[PDB]
Design a protein around this ligand. Sequence first.
Ligand SMILES: [Mg+2]
Ligand SMILES: [Mg+2]
Ligand SMILES: [Mg+2]
Ligand SMILES: [Mg+2]
Lengths: 225, 136, 63, 386
Amino acid sequence: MATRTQFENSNEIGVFSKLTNTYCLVAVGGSENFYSAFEAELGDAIPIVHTTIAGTRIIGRMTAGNRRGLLVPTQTTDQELQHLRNSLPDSVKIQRVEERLSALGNVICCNDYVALVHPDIDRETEELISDVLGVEVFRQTISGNILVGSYCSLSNQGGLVHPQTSVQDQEELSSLLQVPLVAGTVNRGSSVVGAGMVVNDYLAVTGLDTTAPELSVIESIFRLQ
Amino acid sequence: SGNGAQGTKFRISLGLPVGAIMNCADNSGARNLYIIAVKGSGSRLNRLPAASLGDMVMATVKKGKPELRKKVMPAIVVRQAKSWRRRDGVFLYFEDNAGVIANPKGEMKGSAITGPVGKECADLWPRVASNSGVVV
Amino acid sequence: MKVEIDSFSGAKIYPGRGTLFVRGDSKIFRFQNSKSASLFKQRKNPRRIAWTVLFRKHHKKGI
Amino acid sequence: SHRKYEAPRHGHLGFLPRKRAASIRARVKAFPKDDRSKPVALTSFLGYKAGMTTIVRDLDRPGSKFHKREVVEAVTVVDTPPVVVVGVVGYVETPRGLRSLTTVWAEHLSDEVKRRFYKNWYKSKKKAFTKYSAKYAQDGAGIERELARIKKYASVVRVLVHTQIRKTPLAQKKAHLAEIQLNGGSISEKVDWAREHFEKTVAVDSVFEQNEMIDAIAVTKGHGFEGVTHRWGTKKLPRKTHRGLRKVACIGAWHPAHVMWSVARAGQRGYHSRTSINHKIYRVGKGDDEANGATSFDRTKKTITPMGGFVHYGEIKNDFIMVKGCIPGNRKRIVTLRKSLYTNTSRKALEEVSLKWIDTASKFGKGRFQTPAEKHAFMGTLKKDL
RNA sequence: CAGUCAAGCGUUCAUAGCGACAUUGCUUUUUGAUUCUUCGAUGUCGGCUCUUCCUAUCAUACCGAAGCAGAAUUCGGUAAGCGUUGGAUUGUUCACCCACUAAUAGGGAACGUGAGCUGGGUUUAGACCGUCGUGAGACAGGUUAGUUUUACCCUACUGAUGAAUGUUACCGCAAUAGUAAUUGAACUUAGUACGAGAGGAACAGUUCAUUCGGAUAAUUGGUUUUUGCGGCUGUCUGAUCA
RNA sequence: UCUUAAGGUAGCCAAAUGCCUCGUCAUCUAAUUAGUGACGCGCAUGAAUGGAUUAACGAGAUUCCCACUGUCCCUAUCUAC
RNA sequence: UGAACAGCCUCUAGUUGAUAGAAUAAUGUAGAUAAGGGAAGUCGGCAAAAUAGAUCCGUAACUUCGGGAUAAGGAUUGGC
Ligand SMILES: [Mg+2]
Ligand SMILES: [Mg+2]
Ligand SMILES: [Mg+2]
Ligand SMILES: [Mg+2]
């Protein structure tokens, strides 16, 4: 399933949510339908944490997540950090990042094995990503889009990239990430695919205005069947 | 703001009246935006309609590309440079006035934002938070 | 609460006190008062202003 | 002809005349409505405004964007020594309104309350209530006939109380005396409570408690004669205006051939009695206690007084009320704090408030330190300290 | 500006909404008509500022009717409590566009308001052009430059004292007078009711905001004769210190 | 061809001269009864009543732009008299 | 000091005259400063602000070839 969901009318689910294999994060100011989608589809096996990052309802663009670790910005308060430490399982590691770009979901596009980052990140932050997430890192842009997290949706099975992407960039990124990539649109043609939707190994959640060919492209590239 | 607001906004000290020229932060090829109107502003005799951070305004491109000049379009203020108070009581300000171009529903005409944006704007507009590099 | 440090003088900043300034290169400065804020805007070097923590650390005064 | 552009009226017509108040202590024009089921308690209290400070607390509003997040708010401090009960009075109700019929005083009156009955205290024989105390020290003869008179009549019982001005840093020495309504029990229970509490002190926590919405009645800060531009907020006339520009241009039409009362004019600004409602109590502090300024999270033993004392006031050695926001009147002024005239739910009047940190830095400048121990620890040793 | 009658329009159907041929009125925010008052002078444009009043109600409150399924809209009632904006051009009133908004309703008060302002226009004397005139000169033709006086009196209004009520002091009562709050958005209800679909509400609840008002100065900003501290120029006190 | 002494030539223009008129088209602006460039059956332009052009100059009249600012949003404070 | 019988301070000489005292309300007259915006004010940028000396670099259209021109636009300046 690519599950049709709105955040109070918003068809961008990746902005307000962060979904990994092991956990899920949702914003505190959410509707009953928005919570019920993650509660029904994810089930009781996977914890869902209602969280606020840096005083903001936006959490997907603020944080970058992995099954092994979670990265939070410097502006995240101690109460939010302690609540995430209690609510999250003991396996994941939560570490604050002290870096100027500070919006880790926009900066970092990552999965379990390999990650794409903004080219201009600091070397200490790159080593921190490689340490906490245990993930090999490449500094690359998707056809000149420096915000790889906003302009790519990535999982273990496959990836969706920006629609206006050069084909040469598509095989280059596909060989670099060792996963097949498809250029496509989400939410009735919105270009920002990573902000448009969240995905993991068995679930994808998207906006209600995402059309049927777009949803078919999602389930084909992410192998959710 | 008005239609495309995702939630409400606390009152930010108004810093951009009508006639203000702010930098154009996105990559749409426009250089500055000239504010002619503020969405949702009230009516008082002699009072100029002023804008704050996170507000949607009506603006014209005074300097930039000729297909963007000589027409009115909606814009969103992302940097204010007039100091305002949050409910945790810090007084903060950027060093320039800056906004981006959008449609009336709020999605950006451009694709990337240079420089910081305010969290009071990023929470209120998700497309701005999507294309934003750093949110403070 | 959190007690922040002055970006110019190293003084302790209590909640609701002073100002904050986000520069165009996305760097955050925090000023405890208008005196240190105005010295920052006048572009003085804190290594040469005699009452700052960075000056006293440089000059080994009370260290 | 008609006004070309509409605009709202400058100023509020219900706050006229903008004259100076009759006294420096504002009158309580209305008390909370009585019900004869609760125990006998006062409806109000007297204190002295000391100054303002900030706090940090965790906001609890289920639905706000700042839910479960720290906010910093401005509070004002009212120094409240325990008030001394001297006297009760009863009011019968006539077709021309309420009317007092008797007043029964306490026996021993202190000097600070009997200074209220004098303009030249230093040259006096101090003969005040001397024949009244001579009416006392019999068995009961001239006393409980007036008390049973208040029981037999007098549908409203009010208590004469007076502050303890000598416990405050004020240099006045002459206490303030007031009537406070009792709002519990029957008439006999009210006057029995008063008779038992003659010459006795009543503390502020007996009448107030935390998270209670109260009203402040006080006379505002005076400003003397003021022009129309700041007194009423009218628009300044343009720069090239002959004969001045802080004025109102048209003060009326040709007809009616008089200046109207509704036209804004120059005169006295400030020193008006005001009643400001719905102020939440954050802390009822005890003066017989160190760590008044400490919370459960801060836990550093410091009193509520800032560094160098409150500016123009001094110390807070007595009990105090920390109340949210601004109240009318300036520092060192008598202020009457009153219970609310109605029950407010509002999901804001019912919020339970627990403070996290209280500011005790100096208000006589940009204070950097909360305690002298913290200042000494930060700055190290000085030349004056050996 | 409002009625009465109703041949017709409205698929059908006079009157949901309109309404010809006729006819009865109201108003003095149009322009006329008249010459009553003023020629030993009542300062004739417009704008700015400010108060109050009227209702023939643009919006907001509660309702009735529909060619009212919902959404949007139209007609009407009680209603003047409350509001009715920012600009480009023009001296303008008016107009015409841009835009926001719940809405950008109409008017009066000596065509409100010049010892309140302004002086762009009109409307003296300088000057130019066009037309007219032999000419001096003329032109609800165009253009440019052109002194805006006085309140200290009485009343009114805003504030401030105060004799006399045996004296003085404290605490009060309340006749009368005034009065104040206003409007919107978002979430949810709910893609629900309704509908064939396109579309698409409302009540209760929550969080904010606009306009207004009364205070206040903990914080932030402004202000500096704290001439408080430091720096700098020129000169003077022989230099130094000051 | 008529009429007349002869019928406005070269140039110029909604010009300080154009009633209609806020003329029409373009440009300038988000929007222009303003400005500029064109057009000309020009109420009523025009050749020492001087026509057209023109560098430099102007306490002359008008429009736009940059800088600048309490002119303004929206007022606040200080000094002397 | 400085280009300078500019402005500012001093020497010789000459005055110390102009009803005074006490407070520091409004409105004035004269002098000033203002966050953010920058003519949205107004008939109209009225008024105020900004620029400013000197040295070096650089300087357009047009022109009656003389100018425009300090065009515009940049950099520097103390003491030892
Ligand atoms: Mg105006
Ligand atoms: Mg008028
Ligand atoms: Mg009107
Ligand atoms: Mg202070």
